[PDB]
Every structure is written in structure tokens, then in C-alpha cells.
Amino acid sequence: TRDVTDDVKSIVRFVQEHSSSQGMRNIKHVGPSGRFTMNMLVDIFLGSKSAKIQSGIFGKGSAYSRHNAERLFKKLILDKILDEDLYINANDQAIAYVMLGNKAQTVLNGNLKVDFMETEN
């Protein structure tokens, strides 16, 4: 039903912004520790107040039910727009964190439109 292209474009723009300090000579890289879990991305999006970041896309998710906002990211991974790798921390825990998939650049070029099915329950 509902077309979510502009939202995904911004989610993608956003995820990539928090990957480096783009600009100054040393384009130094973030993560794995500074990368987001899907859940932290949901929280941020749904302008939660446990959100790690509270700028960029913080407001944007306010018309989505948590359940849906979830399903949207699940989709964005599936669709290879966003992807997720594992990180192992010092206490030997495996944490799945998000990053762009080979499809992210596509959506940023108007070339893919993203549509979403709003689910109840």
C-alpha cells in the first residue's frame, strides 16, 4: 500500500553518516562498537527516549506502530538495502549490527522505490 521510499532514503543516509567523520583529512571509520543494532535503529526512528542518537531521523518514525517500524527494517535487511554483521565483544557475546547492503546506493539514486505492507497485530 504505503510508499516508504523517502523514509528509507533517509534511514540509509543516516546509517552511513554514523560510520565515519566524513570531511577532515582522516576519514576515520566507526563501528563495530559504534554501529547500531536494529533495535537501536528502531528506537531512534520511533523517536524513543532510550534512543542512542536523538537527531537526524529521530522524529521520523512517529506514524509507525513499533510493530510496523520493526517489520520495515526486517524488510530493509531482506531487500539488501541494509545488511547486518556480527560483532563479538570482550565478554564473548555476539551482537548483530547494521550497515548498508549493495542496494543502498541504488535507493539513493531514485532508481529503486520502496513500498511497504502495513500489518496489524
Curated annotation (Swiss-Prot):
Free-text description of this protein's post-translational modifications in UniProt: Deubiquitinated by USP37; leading to stabilization in order to sustain the DNA damage response. Phosphorylated in response to DNA damage. Phosphorylation requires the FANCA-FANCC-FANCE-FANCF-FANCG protein complex, as well as the presence of RMI1.
Effect of N91A: Reduced strongly DNA helicase activity
Domain of life assignment: Eukaryota
Cellular compartments annotated: Nucleus
Numbered residues of crosslink Glycyl lysine isopeptide (Lys-Gly) (interchain with G-Cter in SUMO2): K52
Residue numbers marked as site, 3' overhang DNA-binding: T37
Positions of region (3' overhang DNA-binding): 37-39, 48-52, 87-93
Region span, DNA Holliday junction binding: 21-66
Disease: Bloom syndrome: An autosomal recessive disorder. It is characterized by proportionate pre- and postnatal growth deficiency, sun-sensitive telangiectatic hypo- and hyperpigmented skin, predisposition to malignancy, and chromosomal instability.
Subunit structure: Monomer. Homodimer (via N-terminus). Homotetramer (via N-terminus); dimer of dimers. Homohexamer (via N-terminus). Self-association negatively regulates DNA unwinding amplitude and rate. Oligomeric complexes dissociate into monomer in presence of ATP. Part of the BRCA1-associated genome surveillance complex (BASC), which contains BRCA1, MSH2, MSH6, MLH1, ATM, BLM, PMS2 and the RAD50-MRE11-NBS1 protein complex. This association could be a dynamic process changing throughout the cell cycle and within subnuclear domains. Interacts with RMI complex.
UniProt record similarity statement: Belongs to the helicase family. RecQ subfamily.
Biological function: ATP-dependent DNA helicase that unwinds double-stranded (ds)DNA in a 3'-5' direction. Participates in DNA replication and repair. Involved in 5'-end resection of DNA during double-strand break (DSB) repair: unwinds DNA and recruits DNA2 which mediates the cleavage of 5'-ssDNA. Stimulates DNA 4-way junction branch migration and DNA Holliday junction dissolution. Binds single-stranded DNA (ssDNA), forked duplex DNA and Holliday junction DNA. Unwinds G-quadruplex DNA; unwinding occurs in the 3'-5' direction and requires a 3' single-stranded end of at least 7 nucleotides.
Domain notes: The N-terminal region mediates dimerization and homooligomerization. Both the helicase ATP-binding domain and the helicase C-terminal domain form intramolecular interactions with the HRDC domain in a ATP-dependent manner. The HRDC domain is required for single-stranded DNA (ssDNA) and DNA Holliday junction binding.
Name used for this protein in its record: RecQ-like DNA helicase BLM
Provenance organism: Homo sapiens (Human)
Organism lineage string: Eukaryota, Metazoa, Chordata, Craniata, Vertebrata
Gene encoding the protein: BLM
